[PDB]
Structures are given as structure tokens and as C-alpha cells.
């Protein structure tokens, strides 16, 4: 039961590729899916010391039914649009996700080239984002981003499908959203105001004390306890991206979890709000422009095709 | 002695190329920025001492110069000359300001670009923005090592920096930019040996082909130029690969520095118009220029005294 | 499955050792910090992904334990036992809390230490603070490679982590700290060969001396201890050099982890009291212990549930 | 049971040392074998943590019987010479193998010095090769080399002796062959011809499609499926080596497997051929000059004597 | 022609600052060391070619100079001038010799310092010893990027090195040291925006405040000094953070090089005494100078010929 | 004006030394290569920008010079002078061309060597090939830090480069190579203190022995040479360890550059023949020279104009 590299850490470079499968493209796609790990090694081995090239392949709900007969992952469905009073989490088309990471962009680009070379005329590109590390693990808002990710055993338990769906053990669910930020508005706030939005100190990344942390802060809304009283956790691999000329300053959100229910709860709290908070204050400076849900199978699953 | 911009600095792993036009009434805002550009570079750059290697080279176009400054002009400064060859065309596109930003990390480039554009917002219109990245062992999108024959040391200084021939602008340089897109499908149809004949060097090892084997229409042959004096005419190239996989964009962002544009223009002419021995540069059969601009990059002192 | 603290992590290039006593009425403030310590570690540590390697191991002393917690105690937890040998003395000094902070850079250690002490200000009194640094090829102030025979992998786990023998505290460990100052003048008076006889290994190459040549009063001989089964009893050492040139302070900060303090104490006894074959450890002729404390380092879960 | 570093990855530097045990040298050898791990740490600790020094010790069939009284590894025998119609895989003497790797040659050299210092007058050197990384993981033929090595769980299953021989669990079998290449002849081929010999693209290391890959290509012949239909796999740690003046351009082949049967099958296919292929085309440019088989015991085994 | 000490070399990750006074009758021992200092630097430094970057700059005080040498004095050499402002005081403290030791690793600094002090034992009394460390992205203890506006290249040479104005000491420089301790409690009481007003630059991005927003009593404003000619007067700063968490010591070790002490002293005067527009430098409201010494750092040749 | 080869560049982690004789009728092929050598260096070297540090220094022997060129000869160029001392002998062995190839990685050296020999195949016979590697902290096979006292900067230029004393060959240098094998058995028989007396420096710390303790027959004493003017005579050494464990080969590949061979020869004479105070260099008691050749390394321009 060998998972894809869904537990691997953040890297300095990433390419996110989202495509839809054109009518009659199913066969070409199936062939690629079985060769994806082989292509990864072909490119990756060239940089074997410190390259850290990996590709995580995700398949959407509608795409799954077109590609495979038999059982479906229990949690796999189209991304649920959230129409909140103020902010909207839109659902956009996407059949296949390629989450490509390395310590260098060239490796990502080479692999992406090989994948798309095989898929040409079978797929239509929906989104392509080239992500880059920004200083000391910062996002476009200038905050350290990824701090509270689970590690080790906790990561395994939060991310990997287990006995609750045994046919797809070793798989995971990925939710992607591309966000664009209003930097003008954001930079109008004082640092202290920004800290109140996020829920952590800007420079030092220290969490605000519970008596000072607003209920509508990002950290407060995305902290979720389950029925057991245990924290519900996701693994985030967000990357900054952008284009200065077009005033694009972005966060590419990607979160892995063993069930989409966890990610969706966090989304709901952010967009719809709670009793104590109208919505996540971060959304006042952030617009989601894409939204897709994918199941990322175990590596074995892709190979045996 | 006049202090040049970082026009002599080597190739880096990351680059941002930014080309803008100055909007109506934007002159004043632009002048203010120009005087702060070196200051902004240090502000961002110092954070990543000593491996950051952040630099920004600022270029000003012909038309823009007259809008910005009174007094003398650089002797060689004019708009990019469009070349309509029998087969291939080197197009001229608008551009008033060039920002050539390099570092060993993209974040540094992006941060500086953000600061520059933040100051210029509402005074300029973006024309082009390219994020360049090192591709393996200094390769381009055609899979060839690219930059090998760049001059170094004293030779670089002599080829790139304006000297006594135009003493008011000593320490300056001329930059020609062209964004090229490549037809990878067609290129990958050729055998490696055929590709080598196009370039003029061995693909894997980057060793120059013997003179008896090197075609007259090879890229290396056409861009090798001797002056009347019999000396080699040389430019300093800082090309970077760039691209977008989804849109099938595989590019070379060409930038070349020289002490006079005449040198770069000769090479362009040989490539696009051809010689007696060669119809045109074979590389153009797989490469399309989509932008073309010429800028003068002043000495650092010049920008500061503003 | 209990999650241990980073007691199995390897040696780093930088370390801060912080030992404090809890002031009267400081218990509450201390408990709050203890529950946030892992959170503070991540807050600072994440900034320097992935080469930072920041970790903090928190230890609690015997007397402090009773002030902080009701319920069961770790089976082996007691105050450091003073050893008054014929010649050398291992002193016991006050210490309630241990912070063993390691990273590949001192800044990370310093930042974390700042955050911890910021929260504890007015609740604790500092007893000791040492900033450790890697010295050449893993050498100590005596000029010998130091840490060679540390257990690794499964052997490390078995030697260091509390298991079924005390199931309520599984995943914990015991840390013994001693700050040593060295008489470099006297030490440098010895020939290299004499120094090798003191340690029990070759100086330059770090190769262990043959059994027929290794003195019974050598450091290696005295600290080699076999258990009832005839297997070696082992500890995990994270010693760091430290010092101040002006004050002629050349130090080894000793810290050793073990699943039971009995192992470390046996080695101490052999060193300070001697055996039938050896009066004492010859290393002590050039080394003075100035502190001595024992701490229990709980599993990470234990700290969090507070 | 603790294996030797048989699963560890490729490094930038390696020393391969093959010796025979002289008459009456048994005792000296046994002493060293029990100290080998100790010597490794003595040298290795000096270059923590980027040194990555390791030594894998192998013992030959004939040597085993001279050294030890009890049971033998089930698969341990002398290297089987293969006399093909055209190419020959020679068997050469070798009692002990020292496979020494680090990120720096000095570390390898220091350890080798210590080992040989202890063995002087008890062993005769047969072969010594100093290997070095060549660009982006290339061999002397200019191809990326090691791409299809198994990793993680697959590596463990392919390499480590398990329950099928429980007394030697955690051990492995190493086959070494020193190859010299005819670079003149090789460089006479076009790149496309070279690709047909190997079975992969030269520059990009992408495997040739199944409809284009020759049956006598290196990749085709070394593929090998077992009765179960699963792939048979070995772990390769080949290093380039050579001397420019003497026109020596070499590949030092070393492959680990849980049973020698796997490696021997690949050898047989290469040298003797199949129904579809006379022999491996790579052998047309490669001459084996040594050939030895060693069993590499678990670390515990070496320590306990 | 004259070979300077490493006074133009950049900031490193690690530093040791050592200040000693020469005891009565210690002159001879000191002279011997001074002639061997470069030799000791190479002895230690060569071991860590090429990334070690070990250097030692040796400075000699005014009073010490007269005790050590007969003949001419550097034109600008005098004791540090104490400044008694209305509110803040720049104290002058004893110091005859300065050793400014830098490397990319502390071990190298410590080894060299050990060798130097080994030779000087019983001839000198230690006054101060500080172990400096890089803090994140070139930050100081106040959390601001520190060193941004240092001159580079030719400008650095012109600002730092003694030239024709004192030809017997060409290639020398003047170093002013001050150890500052910071009141972090008070400082962290300010909002970021208030802190920016104190310094004169943005905290996170290190971008200089616009001239219309920058307070006259900001650090940047007061230390910006124009000469009669209208040119900027510049110094080269190699400040390092240092500190001890337990004792609440958060420090900046200030060291500035200049071709004449007049430049540094002007900046000091503006900071401590104030101008017409500003009572004093606001940074001093959170910073206390605890040492103050002035040294002349001779050309390397000068030390060798001794 | 004349541009030297990379004779001033520092020591690297990897080196290949290649010595060949020119076969009868090979002159033409050799001349062609000589003119392409810099081109080949760039072809390979550019692939590993910027940390590759690939360089090739080409040397031509006395006899070879006369076969290759007409006209004036370098003033100092002659065959290596055999030294038959009472005890030790410095042998002269054949060698027409020297290729001193250095980089931070062996692959780069090997690739370049491959290209050079590929062009020379059937025109030259290999005499010697050594692959050198860095050994710990810049140590040699004797376990001593090696290269410490090399001149740097201006001093290096003055010691190494031919100047006005032979103006036709300004920018050239003279290289003396000797391959030494060491008797490690005998050497390891000495105590460390005895070894230090042989070399003239401390083993571990690389600190030079005081003048009152340093033997007259120590390596450091014999190779310290003053000229008639009282100035120190200096050479630039790029020695590399090499060896083969199986064959008990532990070597130092000696290469020294100087502006005149007279300097190197004086040091050789002192070592092999001795002085009034010393029979010979004690290092030779554990070191055997197995090759000896002298080459002139022309300015880069000289090779190009061919
Ligand atoms: C709009 C773009 C977003 C930005 C700029 C952003 C930024 C941040 C930052 C700065 C933190 C605190 C440091 C950390 O632990 O990573 C954080 C925490 C977190 N974010 Fe986001 N975030 C974004 C969107 C989202 C979304 C859409 C989700 C969930 C679907 C999410 C889930 C989380 C979670 C779970 C945490 C950790 C909370 C905790 O347990 O302390 N984020 N984010
Ligand atoms: C006074 C300061 C000390 C110094 C400078 C020192 C130095 C060394 C050195 C150089 C070694 C050999 C290399 C190695 O395996 O690490 C060593 C080994 C060792 N030291 Fe220490 N040590 C000191 C104090 C202690 C103390 C107090 C203990 C016990 C509580 C201790 C326990 C050990 C052990 C167990 C070994 C490994 C012995 C073996 O199995 O070979 N050391 N020490
Ligand atoms: C004569 C020298 C040899 C050279 C230059 C060589 C080179 C290569 C190359 C370039 C590849 C493709 C990249 C890779 O997967 O590593 C490869 C694959 C392989 N080689 Fe070799 N090889 C040699 C000898 C051998 C020998 C003697 C064996 C074993 C008997 C062997 C077993 C393999 C295997 C198992 C593969 C992987 C094939 C797959 O499953 O896709 N090779 N070799
Ligand atoms: C037998 C092989 C040799 C070895 C192992 C060796 C080793 C050393 C060592 C360890 C040093 C002291 C550190 C240093 O400054 O580099 C040294 C210094 C030196 N060696 Fe050698 N050396 C050898 C042969 C030679 C030869 C043949 C010459 C020149 C004829 C030479 C010239 C020098 C010089 C000039 C110095 C510096 C002396 C000073 O001013 O302090 N060496 N060598």
C-alpha cells in the first residue's frame, strides 16, 4: 500500500497543472497515468542528490467515472461551491491535477513538459501556476505560512486513507483554490491590524494568546475540533506566485486530507462563518478564482492500469 | 571614474525582465524612481548577503530619453530597427523603460520588481514581463549550452562599456531585447546531428564544430563578426529560458549588451537578411521574435544625480 | 504510541543550554509555557525549513516535578547524586528546568530561547546559559573527535527511551548535564601520545587504541560498561565545546541521555570514585565539573496535555 | 536484524576494493571483520553530517568456508562464467569485497587505508577502483545510469534476505563486474543509434516507447518478469572510473539482490541472449574484465565473533 | 602600493571582538605578536579554504601607539572623545589593542583568538570579548536589516582607506567601537510604525521612508551627513548582534571604519548632542553604549616590518 | 597588456596532472590543440557555472619548445636539472607538455582531459597521469596542512609572473613538477613531536614552530630563502595528495610556479644538496621523487596567436 508523495515537505519550486480531459481522450490519459511515476524518475534521477522532484497526480469526480469501472473513493465528489453573504468559493472545471515539486524550477518544468507532451490533443489546460518560495517561508501577505502543518505520525493519520475505505488505502483528497490578493488594501493596514487578521505575529510567527486572538482571525476559524475533542488537521502545500505587471499577487492553495469533509468544514467556517464570526477576515483581501477537488490514488493504483 | 551598472555581472539562476511604456504625464514619477532604483536594489538585496547576487540594470529607450532629459543624447540611441527579411522578420515593439533584474533566487527578483512597480503605478503601462530560470547545465529551450563564448574580464569591458568615443556617457551600455518563441515540435523532428549543424556546436559536450564541418548558415558562423580592423566584434548575452507548458510556450529571452548598437545590429542583419554565403540563420527556422526594443543603460552615477 | 521529544536527533553545529530554577509561586506560569513549548519551536523553526534543524528538549528536575505535578513520578527521577571521590568531586548544582536547544545556526537557538524566557520572566531564575559551537571536525577543546561511539538507529532507541519498565512515562528519557572547564595549559604539556593514553583513541585519526595498549584508567576504558547480559550499556551524548578566550575558559558542556539514570551514574561513579584497576578517570586530571543536574525529559504528548 | 548500508543511495565518490585471503590469513581477516563497523564510525564521524561515509563488506563462496564453520547462505556460490557465442563474462578471484562510498573521496581513502593497514600481509589486492560522479548521474557512454533502481519498500523486498533463509536475514548478494568501454566505436554511432542500444533517450533519459524499443536493447534484456508476473529488480550502484592517458573509460558494475538468481538471469540474457535477441548490444562496446559474487552479511553478523 | 588589512571585506556569519590593554612592561611581547598576526591568520585560515573566510583586523589605540612606536603618528589618532549630551552619554573606556576577527564559522574565530591570546598571556589584560552572530536576514536585535547603506567598491575604498592626506600611513584606517545594550522591553512596547519612525526605514522590507515622512530625529536622518562639497560622508559598518538570554542582554556591537575619525565623530555628535532640528537620535532611547574606543588599523606591511 | 594563464588561481578539491611527450611528426597536431585549449576549457567549464572553477594551465618543455617554435626562447627555459646529492637524488624524467587541470569536481577535470587527449591521440605518448584530491583540512599524505605560506595578491603576482626581465614573454611563468611517493611506514614510526621537527610546524594546528626550536634541517627552514637584496624568494605551490591503497602508494604531486626557475632550483638545491648547517631536508628521508620536469607556461595570448 504505497502512497504518492503526498506527505513530502514544501519545496522552493512548484508547478501546478490542472487540465480537463477532452471527449475521446480517455485512452491517452490512462496510458500516461500508468507512466507518470516512470517519467518522474526519468527526469528526477538526473538531479538525484538534492533535486527532490516529485509529482502527485489527482483525478476529479466526473473524470473518475469516465476513466474507471468499479468502486469509487467514498469521499470523491465535485467541489462544493459556497455562496456566502459576502464571499464566494467558486467551483471551476478540472479533471486531472499535477502537483509537481522540486528544489529547482527546471526539474518541475522538464517533467511538466514530458507529461503535457504525452497528453497533447487529449486534454485542455485549465490552469498553470509556477510557485516559488518567498523569503523565510512567507506568503504574499508577508506571513510565515505552513507553520502548523502536522508532521510524522500525525501527518499520516490526517492525510492517508485507511481502513475506512480499504480499496483506496494509501490515497488522499486534494482541494485546490487559486487566490489573488488585494495588496493595496492589505498594505493599508498596520502590522498590528494584519496580525489580528491572521492570528499570529508577523515577524516572529508566534501565535497570538487566546485572550487577544479575534474570533474572525484566520487561525481561529481554521482551528476545528472533532467529536472526539481531537484537532482536525490538513496538510497544506501553498506556494506564492504572481506577475508584477498584471498586479497578480497570489496564494496557490492546496490541502491534503484523508477525507474532504475536514477541508470542507474549514472552507464553510471561512466563507459562511460561525455564530461568533461573519467570515474569515483574510477573505477581505483574498479572492478565490478556482476551486477543484481531486482524489490522489496510491502509487500502486496508477501503475496497475 | 564613472561607475557602470551591473552590466558586466554574470548569468544567474533567476531573472525578471520588465518592459514598460511611460504614460502621459508620468515623466516626474519616473524620474523620482530612477534616482531611487539603486537604493531599492540595496534595500532588498542586503537581506540575502552574500549569496543573493541581486542586481537591477535600468535601460531607457530613444523616445523616452527625450521626454525625460534635456541636454545631450547617447550617440547611438535610436528606436529598434525593424528587419523585414525575405523569410523572417525582427519586429519592433514599444518599450520606454527596461528593468533587467537578476538574482540567485526568484523571490529577490520578485520583491524588487514589486517595489519598482509600486512606485510607478499609474505612471507606466506594462508591455512585457518574463520570469527566466536556469535550465539544467546552462541550457536553453533548444537543449544547447547557451552563453559559452561570452567575453570575460578586460575583453568584456572593452566590448560592453561606452568609453572615450562618447565621453559624456562613459560607463553606459546599449541593450537590445527580443523575446523569441521556439517551435519545439519541428526542432525535435531533427536528429541531434542536424541540430548541431544548425547551432554550430556539439549538443551534449558544447564543443565547437571544426571549421571544415561548420555550415555557413549555422548560428555560430553568422554571429561571428570581424570588424574592419580584423578584431572580433563581441557582445555580452544574458539570455534566459522561460515558458508555459499549457500554452506550448518555450522561449528564449534574448538580451545583449554592447558599447555601440551597431555591433548587435550587424549580427541581427546577418541573421535575418543573410550574407552572400547564407540565406539566413537556420536557428530562425525554429525561432520567432515577438518583441524587439533598444535601450541605453546609463552609468549608475547618472541615475543618482537626478 | 507515545511520541518522544527530539532526544534521538543528531549533533548540530550550534546549541544553547539553558538551566533555570522555578521561583516561589512560578508554578502556573511554568505549566503554561510547558504546554506551548512545541508550538514555540514550530513558530521559530518553520522559518528556516529545511536546513534549520531547530529542536528543543525540555527537562524537569526531581524537586521541580513534585511542585508541578500530582500523581505518579518517573521511576528513576531523583536529584543529581554528588560524588566525593579521593581526588575529584562531581558537584550537584540547582536546576529545575532544562532547555536543550539545537540548530544548524545560532540565531534559531537564540530566537527560541528569547521566546521561552520572555514567557518565563519573573517566574524563573537563570542558573546557567551556555552557547555551544562545533569545533572543526567534531572535536572538543582537548582536540579529540568527540561523539564517535554514540549509538544509532534501533540501538539508540533501546538505550535512550523509557519503555515498558515504566509504562506511564514511555517515550521519556533522563538527561544528566555537567559543565566542565579544562586546564589547557596542563593538557598541552602532555605529548600527543600521552594524551592518547588519557582518552583511549588516536588523536588525529580517531581510531580506538588496541586492547593491549589501552590503559585501564583511560576515559574510553572507564566509560565502557557491560550489563548483566554481557551487552554494552550505552548513553547518547550531545556534548558541545564552549568558551571565552579572555577569561581562559575552555569548556565541554556534557549532556547524556539514557533510559535510566543508573547507566549514566555507573559511568560517573567509575570516573570519579574509580575501580580496583584505576584510581579515577585520567580525563578528570584536566577537567573540572562546575555544574551537575539530572532531568527527566517527558514524551511530547505529556507536555501538550497540560 | 540490522543490515549493512546496502539500501543507501549513490554517492559522488566510491572506492571498490577486492582482495584474496592469503594462506594462513584467516585469523587476521576475522579480527578486521569484527572491527569494520568501528573503523567506519572512527573515520565517518569526523565529517558529520554531510560526509555520508559507508562501507559494505562482502565475503565470497570459497572464502566463507575458510572463515566460518556453521551454516552457509543458501545462494552463495562462485561467480558463474558465461561463455556466449560472441561475448564472455569472465570469473576472476576475489574473497573479500569492500564497497566504500562517501560524498568525498578523502573519506573513502582514509577508511580504505585503515582497513588495508590491518590486513597487510594477510590479503593480496586483486582490484582497486576509484569511482566518481559524472555530470548528471551519467556513465562513460553518456547516458543517465541508475534511473530504474527500486526505492523504499520495493528496494527492501528486492535486496534483503528474508524468511526464505532466516539465519542470514538482513544480508544481500553483490555481483561485481569491471567493464571497459570502446569509446572510439561508441562515438562512431549517431545519438539515435546509441539510444537504440540502450533503450532510452540520451539527453532526457526518457524510456523509448514499447513499439520502438529494440528487443536487443539493454533495457529490454534486463527487464525480467518472474513467474508471478511481477518485475524482478536489483539495486545498482555503478560508478564511472577511468584514466585518460591509457584510454580507460570504465563502468564499475555492482548490483545487490536478495538472491543471485535474479542477477544471473539478467547476465544470462545479456551474454547468451534470448529467442528474440543474439545478445545485449551494450556488450558490443563493453568488455567485462572482472566478475565476482559476494554475500554481504547483516551488520550484527560481523560484530558477533 | 601599500597593502591594507581586510578592512574592506564584507560581513560574515560569525565574529569575535577582542579588546585588551597592554600591561606595564608588555610592550615587547605585543610587538612580537603584531609581527606574527598575519602569519597566525594564515596558519588557522588555510585549514578552511575556500569557504572559511577567516580574517583578523588589528587596531592600535592612541596611548598605546606612543608606548609601542617611536616616529610619526597617524594624523587622526587620538583617544575616543567622550560625549556628555543632556540625556545620553557616549562613554570612553580603556582599550589599547583591537582584534576584529571574522569568519563564516565561529570555530575559526575562536581558534585564532586562542592563538593570539596564548602569545599575549601575561602582557595584556582583557577589557572586552564579544561573540557576534548573524541574526536571520542580516537583522539586528531591534529587528531591522542592518548594514544596507554601506558603501561598496570604489566608494568604499575612498571612504575607508587613508590616502595621500597622510602618506606615511596610506592603506590604514580608523575604527570606532561601541558596545550597545538594548532595552527590548521598551522597544517592543512601540508599534511597528513607531519603530519605523525611530529608524527611518520600513521594518520588514528595509525600504527607506520617503523624505517627507522621515522624522528629523530618526537614526537614518541623523547619520546622513553631507560635507562642504555636498558629497555624502560615509563609513563602513561591520556591526554584529550578540547577547545572553538569561541576563536579558540584547546587544549591537558597533564597529565603523573610516579614512578619518572626523566622519565617525560627526555622526556620534549628531546622535548624542543633537542638531537644531532634533534633540538626539531616537535610537539612543532604547540603546546604551557601555564601551567606546578608537583605534588606528595600520596597513598590513606596517605590522610585518616590526 | 599580456593576459596570463590561470597560474595565480587558488587550490581546488580536484586536479588532473597530465604529462606527455610529443611523438615524431606530432608537432602540427600539437600546435592546433594549443590554439584551441582555452576554447575547450570554456566549452566544458561553462556547463558548471558558477561553482565549477575549471581551469587548465598548459606548459611546454625546453626540448619541445625548439621543436614547436622558431625565434626567441624564454630566458630561463631549460631541461630539469638532475640533482645527485650525497643521499637523495632529484631525477629528471621526460615530458614535453604539461596540462595542469583543476576544478571543484573531478568530472569537469576528466571531461576536459578527455577532449584534450582526444585531439592529441596519435601525436603524443602519455608519461604521467595523476588524479589529485583534497585530503581533509588541506592536508597532505604526511598529515600536515600543506600550502599555508603561499603568497597572495600582489606578492603572488611579483613572485610568479615574468615581467620586464624578459619582456617578450611577460605574463608567462615556470612550472616545476615532481611526483613524490612517501614511506608511510617509516613516517608513522616517528612521534608527532619528531614529525613536527621534520616539517617545522605544529601538526594539528599548523602553527609555525618558534625560531629557537625550529631545526636547521626542517623543511620550512630549508625552503625559506632570502635573495641578495634581503627580500624573501617565494613560489606558488599547488600540490595535491594522490594514491592507491592496494599498491601502498601515498603521494604528493608537487607543482610550483615562479617567475624564474632559479628560485625553485635554489630551494631544490638546499633540499637535496644541503647547506653548511644541514646535510639535507629531513622530509626527503620519507619522500622519493619519481618524476622531475620543468615547463614554461606562456601567456594566454601567446597560445591563441598560433
Ligand atoms: C487565502 C489564502 C490563504 C492564506 C494567505 C493563508 C495563510 C495562512 C497563514 C499565514 C497561516 C498561519 C501559519 C500556518 O500555520 O500556516 C495559516 C494557517 C492555516 N490555514 Fe491558511 N491561508 C489561506 C487559505 C486557507 C484555506 C482556504 C484553508 C482551508 C481550507 C486554510 C487552512 C489553514 C489552516 C488549517 C491553518 C492552521 C491553523 C492552526 O491550526 O493553527 N488556509 N494560513
Ligand atoms: C570532561 C569532559 C569530557 C570529554 C572531553 C570527553 C571526551 C570524550 C572523547 C574524546 C571520547 C571518545 C570518542 C567518543 O566516542 O565520543 C569519549 C567517549 C565517551 N565518553 Fe566522554 N568526555 C567527557 C566526559 C564524559 C562523561 C562525564 C561521561 C559519562 C557520564 C562520558 C561518557 C563517555 C562515553 C560513554 C564514551 C564512549 C566510550 C566507548 O564506548 O568507547 N564522557 N569522551
Ligand atoms: C556494461 C556496463 C553497463 C552500462 C553502461 C549500463 C547502463 C545502463 C543504462 C544507461 C540503463 C538505463 C538507465 C537505468 O535504468 O539505470 C541501464 C539499466 C539497467 N541495467 Fe544496465 N548497464 C550496464 C551493465 C549492466 C549489467 C551487467 C546489468 C545486470 C546484469 C545491468 C542491469 C540493468 C538493469 C536491471 C537496468 C534497469 C532496466 C529496467 O528495468 O528498466 N546493467 N543500464
Ligand atoms: C616531498 C613532498 C613535500 C611535502 C609533503 C611538502 C610539505 C610541506 C608542508 C607541510 C609545508 C608547510 C606548510 C606550507 O607552508 O605549505 C611546506 C612548506 C613549503 N614547501 Fe614543501 N613539501 C614538499 C616538497 C617541496 C618541494 C620539492 C619544494 C620546493 C622546491 C617545497 C617548497 C616549500 C615551500 C617554499 C614552503 C613554504 C616555506 C615557508 O616560507 O614557510 N616543498 N611543504
Residue numbers in the entry:
A (entry chain E), D (entry chain F): 8 to 312
B (entry chain B), C (entry chain A), E (entry chain C), F (entry chain D): 7 to 312
Give me lines lifted from the publication on this model:
A widely applicable approach is the use of photocaged substrates, where the photocage is soaked into the crystal in advance and then activated using a laser pulse to provide uniform initiation of the reaction throughout the crystal. In this work, we describe a thorough characterization of the application of the NO photocage N,N′-bis-(carb­oxy­methyl)-N,N′-di­nitroso-1,4-phenyl­enedi­amine (henceforth referred to as NO cage) to room-temperature microcrystals of two proteins: a gas binding cytochrome c′ (McCP-β) and a dye-decolourizing peroxidase B (DtpB). Laser parameters for photoactivation are systematically explored, and time-resolved structures over timescales ranging from 100 µs to 1.4 s using synchrotron and XFEL beamlines are described. We have demonstrated a sample and time efficient approach using fixed targets to carry out time-resolved SSX and SFX experiments with an NO photocage over the microsecond to second time regimes.
A small shift in the side-chain position of Asn245 was observed compared with the ‘empty’ site structure in all six of the hemes, and at all laser powers and timepoints. One possible explanation would be differences in the proximity to the bulk solvent channels in which the photocage molecules presumably are present, although no correlation was seen between chains with higher NO occupancy between the differing laser powers. Assessment of occupancies in light-activated processes remains challenging, particularly for small ligands such as the diatomic NO.
